[PDB]
């Protein structure tokens, strides 16, 4: 009837504190087998923070692609996309140093998987190339 309860520090070191939760769900890092996904990681600084918000949600949300999904891991942002992605030159560069360049991105950062080619004002990074082996997908003897 009169069951008093005041915290659980007497058992928190065993109840919820001892349930081996660091061995239930892993996925800390899986292996990828021959994938044509568009990947590229950029340092998480006051630079990426803003530009990323714009660049992606501005163009990729308003009109560009529903993919270009970001993933926050240890500290840097994980920008992954399906098929191909393309960054505009004017949004980020504006906040990342107005009148900046285009190849600034994917030049030599943490990593940027995908072929980047710029044209006028807007660079596109591909990671598929339409499949280098579309007709040679298989060849034996």
Rg (Cα) of the chain, in Å, rounded? 22
Method: NMR
What is the C-alpha separation between 52 and 15, in angstroms, rounded? 41
Parallel, antiparallel, or unpaired: how do β-strands 69-72 and 77-81 relate? antiparallel
Q: Which CATH architecture has domain 1-141?
A: Alpha-Beta Complex (3.90)
Parallel, antiparallel, or unpaired: how do β-strands 123-126 and 115-118 relate? antiparallel
Two tokens at 106?
A: 């994917």
Give domain limits for the chain.
1-141
What is the C-alpha separation between 11 and 5, in angstroms, rounded? 12
What is the C-alpha separation between 43 and 112, in angstroms, rounded? 11
Could you write out the three-class secondary structure of 76-104? CEEEEECCEEEECCCHHHHHCCCCCCCCC
Two tokens at 103?
A: 């190849």
Structural contact between residues 80 and 38, judged by C-beta atoms closer than 8 angstroms? yes
Specify the DSSP element, H or E, that contains 81. Answer: strand 77-81
């Amino acid at each position: 009837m009169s069951v008093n309860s005041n915290a659980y520090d007497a058992g928190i070191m065993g109840l919820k504190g001892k349930d081996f939760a660091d061995q239930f769900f892993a996925d800390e890092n899986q292996v990828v087998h021959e994938s044509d996904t568009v990947v590229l990681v950029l340092k998480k600084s006051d630079e990426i923070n803003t530009f990323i918000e714009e660049i992606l949600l501005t163009d990729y949300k308003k009109n560009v692609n529903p993919t270009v999904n970001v993933e926050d891991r240890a500290g840097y942002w994980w920008i992954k996309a399906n098929g191909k992605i393309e960054v505009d030159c004017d949004e980020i560069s504006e906040l990342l140093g107005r009148q900046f360049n285009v190849y600034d991105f994917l030049v030599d950062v943490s990593s940027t998987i995908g072929r980047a080619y710029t044209l006028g004002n807007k660079f596109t990074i591909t990671s598929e190339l339409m499949g280098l082996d579309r007709k040679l997908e298989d060849y034996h003897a």
